[PDB]
Design a binder for this molecule. Structure first.
Ligand SMILES: NCc1ccc(C(F)(F)F)cc1
Ligand SMILES: NCc1ccc(C(F)(F)F)cc1
Length: 330
């Protein structure tokens, strides 16, 4: 079997992408943030503290004829940005673009951090990292991808994110019309539970390509590109007036500047990120200082190929027994 769903940016900056997901019987449609950096499927629900819900669509297990409470199970998650949420666990039927999984763990949020409350457009997350990272206790639960793998024509899903435009998540097949040239595959380490790989180097603008290994994770759930301080300093040195701002928390640049492209290596291939993808607009309404889409990973501990990098490519997440990541230009 296969599945295919359109994913849409939530705002004019591509801060996140939401994808409709059907849960329960009859279907309750929620718009979830597909996150290859985490492994929990959790939703705003009728059980969420009322003051902590501000416009989100909620899942109501009591109205689903296939929902079953998973007795004794709880979950609690903290994301790398300080976000957190927690609650209890149901199993229910979950469908993504025609692809159906029965008995999927649906984690019902009882408490959510403020950053989720303020995001009215995101009804929850759908984790797509490896199931070793799932936070359900005392019985760990499988992700939607792991549960569907057996039924898929091919144990893959692909991410085709748009620049200020809708895109596509496909499960079970590779759309050979959606990219140009060839797909370059590279090895993945699952030792930390992430889609972790090694980039072979980078270039700034039309500059010389620097061969150097950059280990990092492919994370659809992270907006920006986080790279080592040496690489990020080399990029922003090519932008007149750019500087790192402690009060803002990253590199800013004059909104009048033109940004150079950024190239990253995948084996012998090159993915080019156009400079316009790196502009995240004014730091405050009316400001002439703009926020950069490439930031240092020094304070994080790991390099993150977030949406800024991924939306420049067609990305294959190959969940075969030896997992690999594929990248193609588009
Ligand atoms: N998108 C999920 C996510 C968020 C943060 C991290 C960090 F910070 F631990 F790298 C990993 C994965
Ligand atoms: N990396 C996971 C993640 C994804 C989205 C959000 C947001 F946008 F809701 F704050 C927080 C954390």
């Amino acid at each position: 079997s296969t599945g295919s769903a359109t994913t849409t940016p939530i705002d004019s900056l591509d801060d996140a992408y939401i994808t409709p997901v059907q849960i329960g019987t009859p279907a309750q449609t929620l718009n979830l943030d597909f996150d290859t950096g985490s492994s929990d499927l959790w939703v705003f629900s009728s059980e969420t503290t009322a003051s902590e819900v501000d416009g989100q669509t909620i899942y109501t297990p009591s109205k689903s004829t296939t929902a079953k409470l998973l007795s004794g199970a709880t979950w609690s998650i903290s994301y790398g940005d300080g976000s957190s949420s927690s609650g209890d666990v149901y199993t229910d039927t979950v469908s993504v673009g025609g692809l159906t999984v029965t008995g999927q763990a649906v984690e019902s949020a009882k408490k959510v951090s403020s950053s989720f409350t303020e995001d009215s457009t995101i009804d929850g997350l759908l984790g797509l990292a490896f199931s070793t990272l799932n936070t359900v206790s005392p019985t760990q639960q499988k992700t939607f991808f792991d549960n569907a793998k057996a039924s898929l024509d091919s144990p893959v899903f692909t991410a085709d994110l748009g620049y200020h435009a809708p895109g596509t998540y496909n499960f079970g097949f590779i759309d050979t019309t959606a990219y140009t040239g060839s797909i370059t595959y590279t090895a993945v380490s699952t030792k930390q539970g992430f889609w972790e790989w090694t980039s072979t180097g980078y270039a700034v603008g039309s500059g010389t390509f620097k061969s150097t290994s950059i280990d990092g994770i492919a994370d659809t759930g992270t907006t920006l590109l986080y790279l080592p301080a040496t690489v990020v300093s080399a990029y922003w040195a090519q932008v007149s007036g750019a500087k790192s701002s402690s009060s803002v928390g990253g590199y800013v640049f004059p909104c009048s500047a033109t940004l150079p492209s950024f190239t990253f290596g995948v084996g012998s291939a090159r993915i080019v990120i156009p400079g316009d993808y790196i502009d995240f607009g004014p730091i405050s309404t009316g400001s002439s200082s703009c926020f950069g889409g490439i930031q240092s990973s020094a304070g994080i501990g790991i390099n993150i190929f977030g949406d800024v990098a991924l939306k420049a490519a067609f990305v294959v997440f190959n969940g075969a027994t030896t997992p690999t990541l594929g990248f193609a230009s588009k």
